[PDB]
Ligand binder design. Structure first.
Ligand SMILES: Nc1ncnc2c1ncn2[C@@H]1O[C@H](COP(=O)(O)OP(=O)(O)O)[C@@H](O)[C@H]1O
Ligand SMILES: Nc1ncnc2c1ncn2[C@@H]1O[C@H](COP(=O)(O)OP(=O)(O)O)[C@@H](O)[C@H]1O
Lengths: 742, 134
């Protein structure tokens, strides 16, 4: 049916005038990647671009970015035409001009620095009316092709002349500002943005379809997460990516007035949003307007809450307006809003990961210069507890750390700082490290849900438990139907019992890494904090988080800590029950199987654990983790030493055979002790070398050699002196007795 | 001054605040200083009057607006960071925090030198002992 047109989609290749399509549609269009092609669009405009093809992209989707869409007057989900352009011409002088308020506060011969490297080796197929863009020196500026010596579209010759003159002019109301955001301006929220896009793409791009069928769309959405995460940014990006009218409301602006003005402003806001349908309304600091009635005393506060409720109820009957609200936690606000018709739909943003932090750094490092030393992988690893704004601030701070004293003094007298010297400055990693160590007000200490990185290779041996573990977790999700054919119902809990330091904590994350599922870990100190604080309600919240992060895995360690606290193993007079495990059982029993939330417990004293948590249902399966054996100890040593540089005179099998009744940590400590010895030897040798020849005034004396880049059997055999057993044999006998009496 | 705002009525107080902000903007590059910030914006649990909560929102709106206009900088002084609302400690209002702590023997000696300039002293001062005993 005329596969001439095609759908729009995001663009991977950031270079302008470039595209990416699927592999097969080559003869469907009869052209190559190098072939240049014109592409159509409304207001009777078409732009030329070079071609390229990928595979992941479907055969029905074009890949293109914000600027090309702007110079084509298009959004995502739309459709355009296409036609190859073998009739291109090599274009001589094609007059351009920088057209923006970006000009404001600029100087220097921007022409050369900005353009010559861009058009360099480009052959950029350019057609008049284009608004192409370039970024440099902490700024990003755009130019428009006003004239093309040959027309309409032409190749650029590396030889073609650019007599570049002209003064800034205005952007017609047709096209939008460069500053306007988009999906490409956010990172680390890929899952949430997909949900929102799929949820609210039909009512705005297809309202007549909704009128054509009987179905109830959502007319209210809630987003919760810590501040500085990008909620208003997401809302504005969604509004800009659809063309729907956008309107904003601020909580304090309403509370900073009297009753009449406040409850008139709210009504006028809703009326304007209705009149400008399709439209979107955004509310922030909702807790400042509508907290729970217990915290409100003023009558006017209840009046405004009631006004909000009445307006939300009245929305349903009229227009296509959608409402979005932002809060910190779901429980902070009234429960009357979380009903069927006001704020039914809810969303979490959580925190970005190392990948998300890296993406944010890339976003905020576009205009800024950089050096080779800088790498955004290590920085992302050392930026735990940082969300959004923080990173941005860091970036800025780092930049200033380079400018302040050197550039100020130099420019104070030499000349009025111009663009050339202003942008000549680069950025250095030492500056990033300074901005990180000095300014590290990490703004977060709450729990983190994310996929771990530990892999089976990290763990040593223990193959049989791996097989026993994949069956309990993988098979349900990979093959749910098999269980229906038979009468089985998968279990939801497992318990690990054994001596400490045997990798019990590592499996819970290896499983998640294999299955690519979220993981949450709660340590014993938190359980004791809740016990002493007598706050068992928090338990519920945890599960809710897991409920919203499914499929996921839950971990509990030191589960015997409470029993150990009150009296010894036997305990005080009291029995084996307490206030927290009761709540855990209450939550576990009232949980659905289809949510796919597995539960893992871990301990080393199963004798005193409450039997009630091991009855059929709950935590029925039990697994024993034994001490590593010779063949396992060699694997543990190799895994621990696959990160540090080592010599070859070592005999790892010899050490492993020498060790009996040792734990996994008992070898990591040996590795760390040997590494410390090597560091100390290197430090002493280097300091002595530097100190000795300073007295001898030899201008050049460099016998530069790494004194000890790698360690030998000497340091290790020294470390074995302190290396000794940790777990008593009696404990192993107790474990075996418990494992046999079953 | 905090009390000077609390010693008036709503209209006068929330007119003086705005007028001060406009005056600071007009004379840019300028600086605004606020003291006794706790007297104005403590945590809501300690606030009961509706006017008290109507005087904090105005400040938040002004702080949000500041980012868009002019070169004005704002500095505030408090006894302890936790004594005030947590909504001010955000990105765009009061991101930067600093501590003054307490001077040491060297600082006390320096303060004595500052305060003893125009005064006539004998040869028995030995301010080091006073700083140690201070
Ligand atoms: N995921 C993100 N990607 C890029 N920038 C972000 C992200 N999250 C937050 N920011 C930064 O935070 C600032 C906006 O904060 P905002 O989202 O308004 O805070 P809140 O989440 O409390 O509403 C922006 O300047 C933006 O650079
Ligand atoms: N099988 C193993 N392979 C490699 N390292 C291990 C192994 N078991 C324990 N470790 C080491 O012990 C540490 C984790 O201790 P862990 O076993 O989680 O204690 P616990 O059993 O109390 O949870 C890690 O630093 C890891 O290097």
């Amino acid at each position: 049916n005329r596969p001439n047109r095609l759908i729009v989609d995001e663009a991977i290749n950031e270079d302008n005038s470039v595209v990416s399509l699927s592999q097969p549609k080559m003869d469907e269009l009869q052209l190559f990647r190098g072939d240049t092609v014109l592409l159509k669009g409304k207001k009777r405009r078409e732009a030329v671009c070079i071609v390229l093809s990928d595979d992941t992209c479907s055969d029905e989707k074009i890949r293109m970015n914000r600027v090309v869409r702007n110079n084509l007057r298009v959004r995502l989900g739309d459709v355009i035409s296409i036609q190859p352009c073998p009739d291109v011409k090599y274009g001589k002088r094609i007059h351009v001009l920088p057209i923006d308020d970006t000009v404001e506060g600029i100087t220097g011969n921007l022409f050369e620095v900005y353009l010559k490297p861009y058009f360099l080796e480009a052959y950029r197929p350019i057609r008049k009316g284009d608004i192409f863009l370039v970024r440099g020196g902490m700024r990003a500026v755009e130019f428009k092709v006003v004239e093309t010596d040959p027309s309409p579209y032409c190749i650029v010759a590396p030889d073609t002349v650019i007599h570049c003159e002209g003064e800034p002019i205005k952007r017609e109301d047709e096209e939008e500002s460069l500053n306007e955001v988009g999906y490409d301006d956010i990172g680390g929220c890929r899952k949430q943005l997909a949900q929102i896009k799929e949820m609210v793409e039909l009512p705005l791009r297809h309202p007549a379809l909704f009128k054509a069928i009987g179905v109830k769309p959502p007319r209210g959405i809630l987003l919760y997460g810590p501040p500085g995460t990008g909620k208003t940014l997401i809302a504005r990006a969604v509004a800009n990516e659809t063309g729907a009218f956008f309107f904003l409301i601020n909580g304090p602006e309403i509370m900073s007035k009297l009753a009449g003005e406040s409850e008139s402003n709210l009504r006028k806001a809703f009326e304007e949003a209705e009149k400008n349908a399709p439209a979107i309304i955004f509310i922030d600091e909702l807790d400042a307007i509508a907290p729970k009635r217990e915290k409100t005393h003023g009558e006017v506060e209840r009046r405004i809450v009631s006004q909000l409720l009445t307006l939300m109820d009245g929305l349903k009957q009229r227009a296509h307006v959608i409402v979005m609200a932002a809060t910190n936690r779901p429980n902070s606000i009234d429960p009357a809003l979380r009903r069927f018709g006001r704020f039914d739909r809810e969303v979490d943003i959580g925190i970005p990961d190392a990948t998300g932090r890296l993406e944010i750094l890339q976003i905020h490092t576009k205009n800024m210069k950089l050096a080779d030393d800088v790498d955004l992988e290590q920085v992302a690893n050392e930026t735990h507890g940082h969300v959004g704004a923080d990173l941005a601030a860091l970036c800025s701070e780092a930049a200033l750390q380079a400018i302040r004293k050197k550039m100020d003094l130099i420019d104070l007298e030499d000349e009025t700082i111009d663009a050339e010297v202003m942008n000549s400055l680069a950025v250095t990693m030492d500056d990033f490290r300074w901005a990180l160590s000095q300014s590290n007000p990490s703004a977060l200490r709450e729990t983190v849900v994310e996929v771990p990185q530990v892999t089976w290779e990290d763990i040593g041996g223990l193959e049989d438990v791996k097989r026993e573990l994949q069956e309990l977790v993988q098979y349900p999700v990979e093959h749910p139907d098999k269980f229906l054919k038979f009468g089985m119902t998968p279990s939801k809990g497992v318990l690990f019992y054994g001596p400490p330091g045997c990798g019990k904590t590592l499996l819970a994350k290896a499983i998640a890494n294999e299955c690519q599922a979220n993981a949450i870990s709660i340590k014993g100190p938190e359980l004791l904090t809740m016990w002493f604080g007598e706050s068992e309600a928090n338990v519920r919240e945890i599960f809710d988080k897991a409920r919203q992060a499914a499929p996921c895995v839950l971990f509990f360690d030191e589960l015997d800590s409470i029993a150990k606290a009150r009296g010894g193993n036997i305990g005080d007079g009291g029995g084996a029950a307490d206030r927290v495990i009761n709540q855990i059982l209450t939550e576990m029993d009232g949980m659905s199987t289809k949510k796919n939330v597995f539960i893992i417990g871990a301990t080393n004293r199963p004798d005193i654990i409450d039997p009630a948590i091991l009855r059929p249902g709950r935590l029925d399966q039990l697994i024993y983790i034994p001490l590593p054996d010779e063949k396992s100890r060699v694997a543990i040593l190799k895994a621990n030493l696959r990160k540090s540089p080592v010599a070859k005179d070592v005999d790892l099998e010899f050490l492993a055979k020498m060790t009996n009744g040792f734990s996994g940590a008992d070898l990591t400590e040996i590795c760390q002790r040997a590494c410390k010895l090597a560091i100390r030897e290197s430090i002493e040798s280097e300091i002595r070398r530097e100190r000795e020849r300073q007295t001898n005034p030899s201008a050049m004396e460099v016998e530069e050699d790494d004194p000890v880049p790698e360690i030998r059997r000497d340091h290790f055999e020294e470390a074995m002196r302190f290396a000794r057993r940790s777990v008593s044999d009696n404990d192993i006998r107790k474990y075996e007795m418990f494992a046999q009496t079953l």
